[PDB]
Design a protein around this nucleic acid. Structure first.
Length: 92
DNA sequence: GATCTACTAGTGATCTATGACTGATCTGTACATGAT
DNA sequence: ATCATGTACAGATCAGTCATAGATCACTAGTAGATC
């Protein structure tokens, strides 16, 4: 596909933050995205001065979308990303 | 009725598994050469 | 005139080598238990 990849680790550092997000040697995008989403919803509940809510998950989105009633409606995609300083995959 | 062996509690050293620094490798641009 | 080949330079990433926390090992006082 060139666009799509499976993510493996060389080194499980120790207990490692991301161990809970593993489905083998493979980092699970859906687990990570679910915990991310959970945290965001938790904090969003604690916002009392702004009308902000979490939008229902859109299929094919790497984001957690917020609807803000700043009277007018504003949508904010909070996109979970992994940063890699290695050289770009061959497909590029 | 006292002294040597088997076990428990307690302390502290020694050994054993993980993050940070340095050298080695890789990729590409600028330039010199050689071809039409 | 222009385009392919080889060298230096530059920056970045990757692979290989030391300080720190937890586990393990050694020794001693105190017991009980067995012997004289």
């Amino acid at each position: 596909t060139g666009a799509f990849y499976l993510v493996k680790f060389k080194r499980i550092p120790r207990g490692n933050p991301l161990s809970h997000f593993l489905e083998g040697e493979v980092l699970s995008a859906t687990k990570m995205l679910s915990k991310f989403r959970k945290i965001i919803k938790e904090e969003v509940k604690e916002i009392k001065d702004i009308d902000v809510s979490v939008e229902k998950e859109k299929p094919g989105s790497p984001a957690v979308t917020l609807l803000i009633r700043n009277p007018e409606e504003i949508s904010v995609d909070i996109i979970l990303a992994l940063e890699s300083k290695g050289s770009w995959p061959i497909s590029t």
